[PDB]
Ligand SMILES: CC(C)(COP(=O)(O)OP(=O)(O)OC[C@H]1O[C@@H](n2cnc3c(N)ncnc32)[C@H](O)[C@@H]1OP(=O)(O)O)[C@@H](O)C(=O)NCCC(=O)NCCS
């Protein structure tokens with residue numbers, strides 16, 4: 001972003017070694033046995049002793065911090081995404097469901113699409129001019145680098161690891177977006193020769209041409225290839241671009257500012273599962289027979305406009321986290337609600353270029369394989385969308401409690417009620433108060449949360465007592481949160497010590513091969529919060545086979561929830577987890593209301 005802004009932001013620190021180990025042991029207590037904790041406790045002591053292994057690694061991390069803008073940046077990007085070989089679909093690229101629009105016909109669909117496109121270009125103007133407003137979190141300025149990674153970017157399949165291309169600041173920045181309809185991609189210029197952006201009416205005109213240029217799905221769904229395994233896609237991709245035309249098509253897609261997907265009509269399903277299917281449409285596309293082929297999952301920003309008024313998006317996670325994405329969403333949506341000014345006449349426009357694809361037997365085979373793979377992934381995904389209307393941030397605040405911590409503690413209660421034990425829980429924490437900061441880990445399963453969940457279901461404990469336990473659990477979580485955003489958490493630190501050990505060419509420390517660490521990093525509950533003014537919600541698949549993927553948008557009077565799980569694991573059920581979460585949130589409200597503090 002603006003160099004001046006970034007230069008004033010503090011650099012990502014390296015927490016004290018003994019401090020992070022202390023927090024690590026405390027976070028382990030509720031998720032490991034006494035025997036395992038006692039064992040880990042010894043490993044830690046040895047690990048941190050004077051002249052020991054841990055001390056040498058810590059020294060290394062500190063040297064890394066003095067010779068890089070961010071000691072964690074590249075390591076995280078690589079281990080978290082670039083070296084993650086599983087398909088980006090469902091497993092990595094988050095999905096977003098925006099408020100359903102009111103258009104009732106094709107003209108309306110394109111009308112909103114044209115407006116949305118223009119709204120993105122308006123937001124993009126603040127990026128190209130570095131005039132984008134500064135953001136705060138803990139009362140500190142926030143890194144804006146992510147905003148310069150989302151547009152005109154695209155992920156690239158790699159045989160060993162993937163890469164990312166960014167053309168935003170290239171010699172001649174892209175002035176075109178890509179539009180996908182019935183599996184056919186089109187190169188659409190959204191800027192005039194003089195350098196001014198096209199109008200909503202103009203973009204609309206072009207969308208019509210594009211639409212009439214792909215009235216049937218008689219073209220192979222090449223884009224579906226991008227949903228396969230990264231290793232497989234890498235090879236299929238390397239073959240695909242061997243044709244001049246093909247490479248030219250891919251290149252355009254990769255350089256486009258962003259992609260707009262004009263999805264087709266889907267089988268009218270029951271209302272009790274509608275929202276869930278829409279979530280799937282945005283996350284993976286529904287399937288090869290639906291809209292999955294009308295995508296390109298390597299593209300950083302993909303906006304989706306359904307035929308039934310439904311809309312949303314899916315973005316490639318390597319570029320950024322949710323906050324930056326939603327800020328863009330809020331702006332665009334708020335822009336689509338701008339009263340159309342005086343309609344001015346527009347001269348003829350050029351015919352959007354069609355990004356053709358030369359299909360061969362080999363490519364054909366790759367596509368079919370991609371279909372099979374994607375079909376398996378979809379059939380194994382269990383999603384449950386829950387709109388908590390009972391209340392939002394309003395109640396927790398009236399109780400002088402952090403809404404997020406209230407929600408997280410509720411999740412801990414729900415889980416414990418189902419399984420009778422706590423589990424490694426992950427909650428995304430933003431590290432943007434630091435230059436190039438991405439995220440750190442907040443562990444919702446703690447000593448205090450466990451004391452609460454247990455006492456909560458103990459029919460021998462006074463309600464007055466459960467209240468104290470609840471508030472203490474919430475406060476403990478808020479304290480952990482404050483430390484996380486300030487770079488005082490330990491997960492990224494411990495990861496850094498591990499990677500540092502590898503780089504130093506020393507044997508892998510036992511502390512990292514310890515059972516407790518394996519358990520601590522196996523997140524049965526992987527969660528995050530993505531605030532927004534728009535009544536939208538995000539979702540992603542679980543990070544472990546036997547876990548859940550839970551995301552939410554805490555609003556004032558309600559909370560948009562999303563719960564994912566894998567059908568391959570009989571011990572997990574999205575609907576059930578969501579139901580227990582809803583009930584846990586209510587029981588906590590009931591408990592607090594039954595015992596007011598004020599006199
Ligand atoms: C963890 C995190 C979400 C916490 O955010 P937060 O804003 O502190 O959440 P809280 O629930 O504490 O605060 C929400 C609201 O309740 C208020 N509040 C908090 N504690 C309160 C209390 N004890 N009493 C009254 N009000 C309180 C806050 O002021 C805020 O007010 P607002 O509604 O006017 O904005 C944030 O620090 C973070 O890391 N966000 C990034 C997560 C991310 O990266 N997500 C995407 C991953 S891909």
Ligand SMILES: C[N+](C)(C)C[C@H](O)CC(=O)O
Nearest residue numbers: 428439526527528540543
């Ligand atoms: C979905 N989840 C929590 C696994 C990944 C987050 O979106 C990103 C992060 O916390 O680094």
